[PDB]
Design a protein around this ligand. Structure first.
Ligand SMILES: Nc1ncnc2c1ncn2[C@@H]1O[C@H](COP(=O)(O)OP(=O)(O)OP(O)(O)=S)[C@@H](O)[C@H]1O
Ligand SMILES: Nc1ncnc2c1ncn2[C@@H]1O[C@H](COP(=O)(O)OP(=O)(O)OP(O)(O)=S)[C@@H](O)[C@H]1O
Ligand SMILES: [Mg+2]
Lengths: 564, 564
């Protein structure tokens, strides 16, 4: 509830919140002071006689440091300076409310992005890209406006309490008498309304998750969709969620419209009813009706905006927060990797008693055993679907094992040191995403540029012929996902991606699948003649690539075994 | 600027907008009549002496229908019914406002997504996926709330004009005084705030664009990012743009808080300055001291809200509108497709004179010639990157030739019939995206489920062993993009995709590169004994796939020439 919120906000944001609360109560005081100092300055106008009666207003004349005219100047300069001060302080306080609410987007977005980027590769494997995007994009933004709404609610409730006391001071009767009436009005405005808004907020978050998923997947299949001609079906399924989302939004905004209107109608009708009941029988009279009706209308007119603000802010905390702040609570309590150990690999790499399965699946391995000395260059062959890429995703730093250990020079590879060991692997993942930028990027993956190293890596992946006759050269852009390229070009850029990384273990996993037999020959011949200081792992369903692999292993419905 | 806005809105909600202008004029009328009618209703309080003077008010006392005390009761029921009526009128108006303003999300969004789904496949190729995701949820939302802002600007300038019209009648000189005063204050407010807001809104749009892409692409390379360890420099790239975006919104909100503050402060100041200007040298004796302060303050207290409204609303139209209203105008003028004619393919598929390069690039073909008789089953082979997939993308629906024709049974394939033509393609891509749902869907790709057909297609892609020993079998979900599978399982599913579609041209383009020699034998053997009624096109770097093909062509820097 609020505990979820105070978990989301860091140990510095809570401090900002308490600071804004104190600033809020103070600004409440100052605005009460403004609306209260309206009256005395207003009264010393057509009738200066108020300087001759009232005990608290007649003591000022006795000073006689000024005659009778010169009182209003000492009143006026102070009044206008206090109002200048009011305007400036309110500007500052509103700018702070901004700095807090709209800055929560930055405060929380990158936090959720970190929590996502840091989870285990398989923990991410069971996640959903579109929901991630919906979190860091839309949900944190609703959370930010929700922060602003909760904050504005707190400031306005403090204003309400201070006005409540100030109205209790003078004519306690009407003040307490009206407090219960307006509170009951709020009770029926909330009880009758709030379920609507909660249901609509649930509707809207669900619809948003939906149309995020639908946009993402159908764009990711655009070509097949254009072949199958069913663009209109995708569009129809999108129209579904868009109508749902928009309908919830319109119900929310119209709800948020109704409380001001209700307060207006009910308060005006009860004012006219009370005066209609007073025309015949009146509990106050002469100078008594003036006071009661005037202080009454002023207090009511000042109060109603605050109360509308209160109700609308709580309903907003129901619309977003409820169906949405949960979506962040559940996202910052996630299994995150850790640690910082370094590891050395100068002899061998034993597997030992592995055994593995996915978070709720049957085992693929069950105490298999294997060991790769530095520079061995082994290769796993099997039938499609038995568990090769899984085993290798296990040998490298992803996928913690279920029984075994994996040892790097007889040293267990665990969370404590898996970072520095991951730093050793160049992958080439068989199906490869290239982010739309330069061919220089992707290859480097952002990490510096060694011009001659990059040209070495370009030549080694026999890309030299491809970049040389592009117009912009190495700087040529690649298209989204690598769509502006061919297949073999995409995979050569992945091979070179990994070669730039430096070696110390070089996985393959169908790295030459999109190349012919001949380009693959060239690439394997340029690679083998450099992979004789590091070890490497070759996964290829087609032969020829494994011609220079020394030991050839083969998985089965049981553990793997050697083969020559 | 507004022409854009009326392009985005259809010939319906354009007329709905005219309707809402009318209704906002009416609500303005009733809203001003409310306060105006409260004034002659408060006039009959402590001193009942106004029923005997003023020419317009004494013409009803001696109607003699009722004594004089029984007048206030009829006036009172008038007031109660009118005020509940005003409540209901405002309810309906604010509902229509929310429904139109927050309702534009649905219609506009599905229109943009329709546009993007309907562009030529190459025209799509030169688009970024993330920009599309943003211009379909982030910028549509950013257009909806500010459609609301445009509405409010129109309604409030209309009510301000009618309110000035009333002030012109009742008390003329201070009317012009306040008019000059507050229009000049609004003007300085606008000319000082609006550049800040334009700059900020440009910054917010730019941040948001850069800020979606990091999310998209790094989520798409997650595996590599965790392997290279660089899983927070990514987070740093995000932190930059999230901070920029948040600061932008900070400036927006803190600015929009300034007009209201400046207006209320300066208004209290003009009240006090006019009364202190009045005390010593007064332009009115005995009369007008109250008649010109009461109505003047009571109407300034209503002009200030609508003035702040107009100012901050125009400023919203600066912040968001410039940023994404332009994006939308731009994303609605875009090349769509067309077509409706039918194509019958019972003999040959001539290509003839086929020239093509990508929209700005050098040519890849230049009048190659081919003619695939029905059922021929040919196959393309070339070196990685010479463009066989481009030729295939031309021979199926997408991709329009620069000079060629492509003739189906001696009928020109063009955008009058390409729809029905594409209907005949079973694709199978190089890289397979399986959206994350049932293994039945993907294979079906939505089009219902015909049991025997699904199972026969499963068994043809030898996936039957897989979905047998699977827990939920043909129902087990596939994971994001097919992540929860193997590459070969993904590929055989895509084979099942193209099989389930019915035949009539069966493209492959390395449909078996992720499968072993034996399972590829199995798949091709299953296919060739069913593809002897339809035609097909294999693109395979590895041999053996092309064993049973009839004619095998080869692509070069020039055209393609047969090979046997
Ligand atoms: N989506 C695209 N947009 C623009 N240009 C492209 C695109 N795809 C390919 N090209 C150009 O066409 C040439 C080869 O493209 P492809 O048709 O992918 O090659 P391919 O030989 O069919 O695929 P491979 O290498 O055999 S798996 C390249 O030089 C590119 O410049
Ligand atoms: N990310 C994942 N999440 C859940 N299950 C998975 C995942 N990856 C693989 N599996 C399962 O584990 C088995 C082995 O997966 P892979 O390692 O992809 O097989 P493979 O031997 O690499 O396949 P190929 O075609 O030879 S690359 C498959 O049957 C999958 O059902
Ligand atoms: Mg290709």
């Amino acid at each position: 509830m609020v505990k979820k919120l105070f978990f989301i906000l860091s140990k510095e944001d809570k401090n900002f919140l308490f600071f804004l609360l104190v600033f809020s109560v103070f600004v409440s005081f100052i605005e009460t002071f403004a609306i209260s100092l309206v009256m005395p300055f207003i009264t010393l106008a057509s009738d200066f006689s108020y300087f001759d009666r009232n005990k608290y207003l007649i003591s000022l004349k006795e000073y006689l440091n000024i005659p009778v005219f010169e009182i209003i100047v000492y009143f006026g300069v102070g009044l206008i300076v206090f109002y200048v001060f009011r305007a400036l302080l309110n500007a500052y306080y509103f700018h702070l409310l901004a700095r807090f609410s709209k800055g929560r987007k930055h405060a929380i977005a990158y936090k959720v992005f970190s929590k996502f980027l840091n989870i285990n590769y398989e923990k991410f494997t069971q996640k959903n890209q579109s929901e991630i995007l919906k979190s860091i994009t839309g949900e944190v933004y609703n959370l930010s406006t929700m922060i602003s709404s909760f904050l504005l609610l707190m400031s306005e409730i403090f204003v309400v309490l201070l006005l409540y006391a100030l109205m209790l001071l003078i004519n306690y009767k009407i003040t307490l008498f009206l407090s219960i009436f307006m509170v009951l009005n709020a009770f029926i405005l909330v009880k009758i309304l709030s379920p609507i808004i909660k249901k609509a907020g649930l509707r809207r978050e669900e619809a948003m998750k939906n149309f995020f998923e639908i946009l993402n997947t159908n764009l990711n299949n655009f070509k097949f969709i254009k072949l199958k001609t069913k663009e209109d079906g995708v569009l129809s399924l999108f129209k579904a969620q868009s109508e749902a989302f928009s309908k919830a939004n319109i119900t929310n905004e119209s709800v948020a419209a109704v409380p001001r209107i209700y307060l207006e109608g009910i308060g005006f009708c009860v004012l006219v009813f009370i005066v209609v009941f007073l025309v015949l029988k009146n509990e106050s009279d002469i100078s008594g009706i003036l006071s009661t009706i005037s202080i009454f209308v002023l207090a009511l007119y000042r109060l109603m905006p605050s109360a509308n603000r209160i109700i609308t802010s709580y309903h907003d905390l129901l619309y977003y927060h409820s169906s949405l702040n949960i979506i962040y609570q559940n996202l910052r309590q996630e299994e995150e990797n850790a640690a910082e150990g370094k590891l050395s690999f100068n002899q061998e790499l034993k597997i030992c008693n592995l055994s593995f399965g996915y978070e709720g699946k049957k085992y693929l391995f069950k105490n298999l055993n294997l060991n790769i000395k530095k520079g061995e260059k082994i290769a796993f062959i099997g039938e499609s679907g038995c568990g090769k890429s899984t085993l290798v995703d296990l040998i490298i730093g992803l996928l913690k094992p279920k029984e075994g250990q994996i040892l790097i020079d007889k040293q267990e590879l665990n969370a404590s040191n898996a970072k520095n060991y991951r730093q050793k692997i160049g992958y080439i993942p068989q199906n490869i995403y290239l982010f739309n930028d330069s061919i220089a990027k992707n290859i480097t993956f952002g990490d510096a540029v060694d011009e001659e190293k990059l040209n070495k890596v370009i030549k080694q992946a026999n890309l030299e012929h491809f970049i040389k006759n592009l117009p912009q050269g190495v700087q040529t852009k690649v298209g989204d996902g690598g769509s502006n390229l061919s297949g073999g070009q995409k995979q050569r850029i992945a091979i070179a991606r990994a070669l730039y990384l430096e070696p110390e273990i070089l996985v393959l996993d169908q790295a030459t699948s999109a190349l012919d037999t001949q380009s693959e020959a060239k690439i394997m011949d340029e690679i083998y003649k450099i992979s004789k200081d590091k070890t490497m792992i070759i996964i290829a369903h087609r032969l020829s690539t494994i011609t220079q692999c020394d030991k050839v292993y083969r998985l089965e419905h049981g553990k793997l075994k050697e083969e020559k």
